[PDB]
Structure formats: C-alpha cells, structure tokens
C-alpha cells in the first residue's frame, strides 16, 4: 500500500465503571478523542485529547465514519482501542 514510516500505536482497554465510558470523539474520516472525563474510565486508562483510533474491537475504523465508530463502542462492556502517538510535555497538561 502507501509508503510512510509506521509510527507507534498501543492498545488500551476501558471497562465501564460508571454505567458507561467517559470519552467522546468526532470526525468523518479521521476520528480523534474530542473530550475526556476528568476521572472517567478513559482518563484512568490513559486517553488524552488528540488520539487517532486505528482499531476498534477488531474493526478497523481508520476510514469508517463516526456513527459507525459510535455503535461499535456500544458493543461489549469494554472496548479495545488502538491509539497512535501520545502527548508529551513539561507541563502536566
């Protein structure tokens, strides 16, 4: 396929703690974490704003549309999300 230095992506799983997750995304083609609960299953998982989703429960959503991604997240207690590249700075952020 395309030729581009394959960055580094990790797999993070979130288990519903408060009757649901604590993160939300938005985007047609590219999906990125819009917001993150101040203490939701997502925050405790390590999900920060600006994380592109690669794989979702064995379902590649690199192109899929938000909607498709949403429903997917509503499948199973938890959801294995593969984020690529994390934030890094001198400030707690």
């Amino acid at each position: 396929g395309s030729s581009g230095s394959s960055g580094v992506q990790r797999c993070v799983i979130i288990q519903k703690d408060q009757h649901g997750f604590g993160f939300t995304v938005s985007g047609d083609r590219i999906v990125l974490v819009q917001s993150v609960r101040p203490g939701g299953a997502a925050m405790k998982a390590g999900v920060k704003e600006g994380d592109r989703i690669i794989k979702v429960n064995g379902t590649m959503v690199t192109n899929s549309s938000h909607l498709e991604v949403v429903k997917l997240i509503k499948s199973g207690a938890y959801v294995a999300l593969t984020l690529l590249g994390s934030s890094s700075g001198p400030s707690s952020g």
Side-chain angles (χ1 to χ4, degrees):
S2 74
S3 57
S5 291
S6 173
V8 67
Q9 51 191 316
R10 277 170 65 71
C11 60
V12 63
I13 303 175
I14 312 151
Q15 66 203 301
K16 59 198 276 299
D17 294 288
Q18 204 278 314
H19 288 239
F21 308 111
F23 85 98
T24 63
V25 297
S26 273
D28 209 63
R29 195 186 44 202
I30 61 90
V31 177
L32 300 156
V33 168
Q34 192 200 75
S35 294
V36 187
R37 270 210 156 184
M43 189 63 103
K44 56 90 81 279
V47 178
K48 285 158 276 277
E49 288 175 307
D51 304 25
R52 209 156 46 199
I53 302 153
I54 318 290
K55 199 182 271 189
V56 181
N57 270 8
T59 313
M60 282 201 118
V61 300
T62 47
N63 153 290
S64 210
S65 306
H66 185 205
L67 280 158
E68 302 302 326
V69 187
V70 173
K71 48 186 76 185
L72 284 168
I73 299 151
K74 316 273 278 88
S75 274
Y78 39 76
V79 59
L81 298 159
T82 301
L83 319 178
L84 203 152
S86 68
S87 192
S88 58
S91 67
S92 75

